[PDB]
């Protein structure tokens, strides 16, 4: 993950105002809801029959905290993501066996949180910037089935 | 295969879009071929620069044709025959290529309708977006 | 949609199969664990062991539910209703699996009759592998 | 790219009683038929509009072992893949514009054209060493991508 100056700007300003106790949650429920076949790896998680069920669910939004937590890591360090999710990897892949597909699901479905929440300042430059990213970080959560 | 719930929803956030449309269709092909540069192999004919007059015509195009199966919703197949033979047949479109682009179609409606891009609406639209998909897909489908 | 000659071919190749159909099933899942470990999550309860009875019986009812569908191919909705609401409503069975399970179908065709295995063929069995595929994922799709 | 000791006996004895000449051909051949988006990119081969025109073509037959030349390299040098393919990424990457999903899908219809060649010859444990390597090297031409 290369990233100019000038996309890494985009990314970095951005990034900088994103309330990260409610993004993560609702990624994770968006794809929990728009992706409907990831619900088995969170069944755990309570009632998830509505959508109004699961964003609501306090689990989730405690859960997809976490998961900002570690793109949060991965911005810091796109020189070596490999080593930033080395252990992310083996859990994603070599425990649970999510199909890495689904990595680039959650990563599109928090690009459309952004676009969302951010409006016309989520301008195509700064999603392209994003895509990069998210590639990035779905590319080495994967390592491990590579 | 769309559900009541769906088709509400996708008439619904459609017409919020309304004079819109052709608007937004040109910032979602905009989109993509800035994050997914390798859709720009179809259209080495275009200028591809951000205020393309290409680029707009050829997003009321792309507008019009989801208007149009919105319009048709239960009948695409028939409403999109022709389209499907274009991108299907005769364009031979990578499928890969109609993910890309629903994909910052969404991203666009999201970045337009903060009130109307519900969880429910967004799964909706995702599987309209795909339908479509699969309409236009379907000569070697 | 499958023109008239794939729906020819793909009535011919399952022809040559035959009785085997059942023994054919049970190797494309053999092939399906082994390849891609990632499926092995949805057969928790499967002893997935080589000779495993389990895994036997079950390609019997995937050859089963494919010799339904080709025998009602101009009415595969219809035909695997049932299917799809197990597969894709009651099981949530990721989309991606059935792409995985499709190849190595074909594979283990590949590897059962070399005369009737030719590109046209291929390309047959692939369109009506991925038709069945959509049928069955079509309840969040 | 792992493979075991057992997986790589699997996987070399079988390349090397494969017709260097005729595989490489009939995989994309059948690519081309098959996946007949991809013929975009092989206009300049001649008639494709039937199958024996595709499977007939000089070009294509030509094309073919070049490729097969490519797999075998990577072959050779499993530990390190990116280093075989940096020059082929650059290629179908930064020149060409292939999607990376259409290395997966050559892959894998190489496997089908090893099944078909090979016959019962072609196991399941076989196929599971093959798919690592296609993955892997599928991977690394897709590394300028990532
Ligand atoms: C962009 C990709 C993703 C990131 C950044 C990510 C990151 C993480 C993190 C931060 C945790 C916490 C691990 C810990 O506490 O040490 C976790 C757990 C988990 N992830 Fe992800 N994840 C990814 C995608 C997904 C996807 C797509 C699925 C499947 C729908 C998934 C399923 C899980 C599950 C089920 C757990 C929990 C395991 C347990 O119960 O302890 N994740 N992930
Ligand atoms: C949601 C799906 C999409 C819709 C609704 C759609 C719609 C259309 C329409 C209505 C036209 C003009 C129709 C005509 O004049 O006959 C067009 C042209 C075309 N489309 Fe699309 N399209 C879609 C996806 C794609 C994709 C994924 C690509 C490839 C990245 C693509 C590539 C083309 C090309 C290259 C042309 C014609 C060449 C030119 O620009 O003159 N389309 N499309
Ligand atoms: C070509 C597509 C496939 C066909 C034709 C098919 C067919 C079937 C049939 C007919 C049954 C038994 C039906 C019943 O008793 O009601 C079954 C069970 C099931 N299928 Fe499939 N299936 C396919 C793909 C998949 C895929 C891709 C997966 C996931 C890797 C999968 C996972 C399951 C599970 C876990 C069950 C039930 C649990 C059990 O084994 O008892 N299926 N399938
Ligand atoms: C498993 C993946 C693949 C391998 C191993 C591979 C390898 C190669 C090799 C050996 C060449 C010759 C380069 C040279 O002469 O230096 C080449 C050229 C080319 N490849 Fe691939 N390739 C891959 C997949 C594909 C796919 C999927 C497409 C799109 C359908 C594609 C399109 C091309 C084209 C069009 C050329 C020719 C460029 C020119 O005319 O000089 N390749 N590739």
Same mark, same amino acid.
């Given at each position: 993950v290369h990233l100019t100056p000038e996309e890494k700007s985009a990314v970095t300003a951005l990034w900088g105002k994103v309330n990260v106790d409610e993004v993560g949650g609702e990624a994770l429920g968006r794809l929990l809801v728009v992706y409907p076949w990831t619900q088995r790896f969170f069944e /755990?998680?309570?009632?998830? /029959?509505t959508p109004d069920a699961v964003m609501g669910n306090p689990k989730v939004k405690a859960h997809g905290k976490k998961v900002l937590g570690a793109f949060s890591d991965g911005l810091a360090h796109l020189d070596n993501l490999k080593g930033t999710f080395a252990t992310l990897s083996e859990l994603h892949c070599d425990k649970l066996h999510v199909d890495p597909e689904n990595f680039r699901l959650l990563g599109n479905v928090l690009v459309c949180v952004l676009a969302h929440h951010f409006g016309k300042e989520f301008t195509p430059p700064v999603q392209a910037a994003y895509q990069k990213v998210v590639a990035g970080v779905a590319n080495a959560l994967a390592h491990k089935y590579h | 295969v769309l559900s009541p719930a769906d088709k509400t929803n996708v008439k619904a956030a459609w017409g919020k879009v309304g004079a819109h449309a052709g608007e937004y269709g040109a910032e979602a092909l905009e989109r993509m071929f800035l994050s997914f540069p390798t859709t720009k192999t179809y259209f080495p004919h275009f200028d591809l620069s951000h205020g393309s007059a290409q680029v707009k015509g050829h997003g009321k195009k792309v507008a019009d044709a989801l208007t149009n199966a919105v319009a048709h919703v239960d009948d695409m197949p028939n409403a999109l025959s022709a389209l499907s033979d274009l991108h299907?047949?005769?364009?031979?479109?990578?499928?890969?290529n109609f993910k890309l682009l629903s994909h910052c179609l969404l991203v666009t409606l999201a970045a337009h309708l903060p009130a109307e891009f519900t969880p429910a609406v967004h799964a909706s639209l995702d599987k309209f977006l795909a339908s479509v998909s699969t309409v236009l897909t379907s000569k070697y489908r």
């Open positions: /755990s998680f309570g009632d998830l /029959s | 299907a047949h005769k364009l031979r479109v990578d499928p890969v």
